[PDB]
Structure 1
Amino acid sequence: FQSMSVKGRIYSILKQIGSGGSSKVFQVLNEKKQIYAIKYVNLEEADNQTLDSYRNEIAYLNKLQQHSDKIIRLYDYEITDQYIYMVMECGNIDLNGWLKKKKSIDPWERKSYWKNMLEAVHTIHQHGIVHSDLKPANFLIVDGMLKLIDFGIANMQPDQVGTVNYMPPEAIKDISPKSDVWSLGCILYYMTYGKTPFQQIINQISKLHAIIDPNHEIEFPDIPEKDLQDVLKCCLKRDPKQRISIPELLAHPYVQIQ
């Protein structure tokens, strides 16, 4: 319940949304009694490369404000040699929290979320950015609308730390815009089938080996949504060159037909 100031404006802390090493996201309230999210970054122990990775993500979030409504709103920020405070839109819940909370998701809710994820990821691709690490936790639900929280440029946990379930097969070998297609593909597979394509594999060394194994058939069960099975099968292709692009996903019958 301790107060804080961002560019001369007062924000009293209400709760703590998440934590990241050297970082903390809090639910706050300003003097006009509106509700915001404030990301606090502790810069004290951080190198010049880390610092520049943080300054790079801020600038992109600041720029990509204008280009898409599928990117988290950044209202203001205070930057010192000591800390970063970023005043963002609060939203309802992250996509991981929502998917973990409810058992089954509505087929319509799924298309809307998909359209939103493609639009978000497309905007960063349009600027030279590949997130390279997409998980439902990177997306925020803001009044039925999914928004991309970050660009995986800056070096979190709600209080998926280093997940492999949404990892592309080229990342296990090692990154191109096609990597984000694999990751988005896994999120959809989770929204369609209730688990990631390789979720069932208890071991991480056995899971890592499965993603890169082409003779390890990924199942694609029969569902009423025929177009959806095709989106899934098109995204989860091991060769990046044989995997569908975002411009092509945005003109797929799934996202476009009533």
Structure 2
Amino acid sequence: QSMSVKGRIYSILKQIGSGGSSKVFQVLNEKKQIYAIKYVNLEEADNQTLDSYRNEIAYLNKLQQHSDKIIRLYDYEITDQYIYMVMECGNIDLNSWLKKKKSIDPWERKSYWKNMLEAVHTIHQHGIVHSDLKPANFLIVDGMLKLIDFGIANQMQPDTVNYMPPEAIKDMKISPKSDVWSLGCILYYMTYGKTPFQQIINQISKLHAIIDPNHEIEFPDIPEKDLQDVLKCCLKRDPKQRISIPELLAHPYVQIQ
């Protein structure tokens, strides 16, 4: 089944994500190369939705320069009815590559963490706060992770409120610190193999736990202390307390050997 984007033509290998009025497809060009293509349908001109999407393209466009830990965008076409974005295709998302795994190599867990921070630092410099980070939002492309999205649009899910931080639940304000927390949970889950409450099931309880000063988060012993320190510093409950992405970038855990 064909597709046209700026008069270049694309044959769909398959759908790889869906949500709202948009679908993502793995696809091939004329010269047998792979790409993802996000196709959004504007027939439902929910006007908040529509500006959310014009805003995502705008940013995705601007962050092409400042980092390649950010998914590449080769082209797009937008009209009143549709939006096609032709992007990079990753081998695999992170959320998967983790569930098909028992032991993560410590060196990889570090290199993925670096990549994580770099990408999140990049979007903070441009004043974006994701506030929705989870493993799905990252993506493997030749050893490097790359952030796929910014939290601008009511995002797809491939084909969970573990990573929800405290401030987002009491506040019913969002700073950068909010992404740190979710990053911690993602690192947490990469060391221990469960987010910090994959084991509470009562949702009313789970969010009382996320916000209960007197619930001591269980921090096991591990081969490397630095990691353990990074993890405690990220999963603090006062944002004013919590470590920053710039402090995180100058941490021993990311800098030494």
**What range describes the TM-score normalised by the shorter chain of this pair?**
over 0.9
3-state SS, counterpart of residue 90 of structure 2 = coil
Q: By how many angstroms is 1:37 displaced?
A: 0.4
Query: What residue is the counterpart of 1:186 in the other structure?
Result: 185
**CA–CA separation in structure 2 for the residues paired with 1:76 and 1:55:** 14
3-state SS, counterpart of residue 78 of structure 1 = strand
**CA–CA separation in structure 2 for the residues paired with 1:6 and 1:221:** 51
**CA–CA separation in structure 2 for the residues paired with 1:50 and 1:18:** 18
* CA shift digits 1:188-220 (9 cap, x unpaired): 000000000111001111101100001000011
Q: By how many angstroms is 1:22 displaced?
A: 0.8
* CA shift digits 1:129-171 (9 cap, x unpaired): 1001100000011111000000001123221xxx210011000
Q: After TM superposition, where is structure 1 displaced by more than 6 Å over at least 4 residues in a row? A: none
Listed as ranges, the gaps of 5+ residues in structure 1 are: none
* CA shift digits 1:46-72 (9 cap, x unpaired): 322110110001110110010001000
3-state SS, counterpart of residue 240 of structure 1 = coil
Aligned pair 1:164/2:190, yes or no?
no
Q: How many residues align?
A: 254
**CA–CA separation in structure 1 for the residues paired with 2:92 and 2:81:** 29
3-state SS, counterpart of residue 26 of structure 1 = strand
**CA–CA separation in structure 1 for the residues paired with 2:148 and 2:95:** 12
Note the aligned Cα RMSD (angstroms).
Answer: 0.8
Q: By how many angstroms is 1:29 displaced?
A: 0.2
**CA–CA separation in structure 1 for the residues paired with 2:207 and 2:4:** 45
* CA shift digits 1:85-114 (9 cap, x unpaired): 111000111110111111221111100000
**CA–CA separation in structure 2 for the residues paired with 1:125 and 1:168:** 17
**CA–CA separation in structure 1 for the residues paired with 2:167 and 2:76:** 36
Query: What residue is the counterpart of 2:34 in the other structure?
Result: 35
**CA–CA separation in structure 1 for the residues paired with 2:128 and 2:167:** 17
Q: By how many angstroms is 1:184 displaced?
A: 0.4
Identity %: 100
Q: By how many angstroms is 1:231 displaced?
A: 0.4
Aligned pair 1:141/2:140, yes or no?
yes
Query: What residue is the counterpart of 1:116 in the other structure?
Result: 115
Question: Which range is displaced more, 224-233 or 17-26?
Answer: 17-26
3-state SS, counterpart of residue 65 of structure 1 = helix
**CA–CA separation in structure 2 for the residues paired with 1:102 and 1:7:** 40
3-state SS, counterpart of residue 205 of structure 2 = helix
**CA–CA separation in structure 2 for the residues paired with 1:94 and 1:46:** 30
**CA–CA separation in structure 1 for the residues paired with 2:161 and 2:38:** 26
Question: Which range is displaced more, 94-103 or 179-188?
Answer: 94-103
* TM-score, structure 1 normalization: 0.97
**CA–CA separation in structure 2 for the residues paired with 1:173 and 1:157:** 26
3-state SS, counterpart of residue 223 of structure 1 = coil
Q: By how many angstroms is 1:248 displaced?
A: 0.5
**CA–CA separation in structure 1 for the residues paired with 2:123 and 2:164:** 18
3-state SS, counterpart of residue 157 of structure 2 = coil
**CA–CA separation in structure 2 for the residues paired with 1:83 and 1:101:** 35
**CA–CA separation in structure 2 for the residues paired with 1:22 and 1:101:** 30
Q: By how many angstroms is 1:256 displaced?
A: 0.4
Q: By how many angstroms is 1:243 displaced?
A: 0.3
Q: By how many angstroms is 1:81 displaced?
A: 0.8
**CA–CA separation in structure 2 for the residues paired with 1:184 and 1:225:** 18
**CA–CA separation in structure 1 for the residues paired with 2:90 and 2:103:** 21
Query: What residue is the counterpart of 2:15 in the other structure?
Result: 16
3-state SS, counterpart of residue 105 of structure 1 = coil
